[PDB]
């Protein structure tokens, strides 16, 4: 196959984590997604101790703890497994942690869950955090930087993806430390539009583009992957992928980006 990484998020909370893997290229047999994120894990906020950790939902937990048959089998077919974390309207966000120690101890917890669960790494997505809740302090320009840096020294050979938006987003550099080349890749939040991340990354790693499969006219998929590969850039962004059959859907992006329609098993 050849052509921009395909990544596709789905919303656990609804959704099965194999149905990425259920899309193929009718010539070849490809992978019709590269990249599959597990859509969320959270940034909760301890207020006793004043120290955010992660956490998983009924969902997320349920999926993580069946790995072997939610995300294994996805990874054996040669799809890379991604858990987000999102905010979880708690006050603590990617952009807050107090010091260096905070955000590593955090990073720690990161790592230690993709280790555990045999994850291909993490993905962050700083939506929801509502920054001052709980007597939170707001977005500092140290905090992420602090973050990306442990958790990339903590699993410095797996993936590390942003999703363009919020206060995180925007504070990738502190005292001389530009954050922007730890991460893999880094993508449009807003489907249906093409808007190019800002982050200092090249063409190869980003994705201006981002769809949600089922709701973006196919015509609008299409146009998207096409700009993508007109324009040069490396990975294309698919959102909130269900169990229906959205073949369809799918093929509007893959003949562009990869000359072949999909197939659904």
Known sequence: KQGPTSVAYVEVNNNSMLNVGKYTLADGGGNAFD??????????????TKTAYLHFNENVQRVLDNAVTQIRPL???????????????????FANFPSQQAASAFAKQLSDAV?????????????????????????????????VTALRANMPDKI??????????????????????????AWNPYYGTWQVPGIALPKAQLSPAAVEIGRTSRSTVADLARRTVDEGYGVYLTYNLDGGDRTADVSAFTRELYGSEAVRT
Do not use: C, M, W
Not at 35 to 48: E, K, M, P
């Open 160 to 185: 590390i993806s942003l999703y363009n938006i919020g206060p995180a987003a925007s504070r990738l550099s502190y005292g001389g430390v530009d954050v922007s080349d730890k991460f893999d890749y």
């Open 115 to 147: 280790a555990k669960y045999g994850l291909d790494g993490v993905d962050f997505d700083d939506d929801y955090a509502e920054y001052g809740n709980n007597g939170t302090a707001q977005p500092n320009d140290s905090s992420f930087v602090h973050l």
């Open 35 to 48: 990249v599959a994120v597990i859509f969320a894990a959270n940034i909760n906020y301890d207020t006793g």
């Open 75 to 93: 990874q054996q077919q040669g799809i890379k497994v991604l858990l987000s974390v999102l905010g979880n309207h708690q006050g603590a966000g």
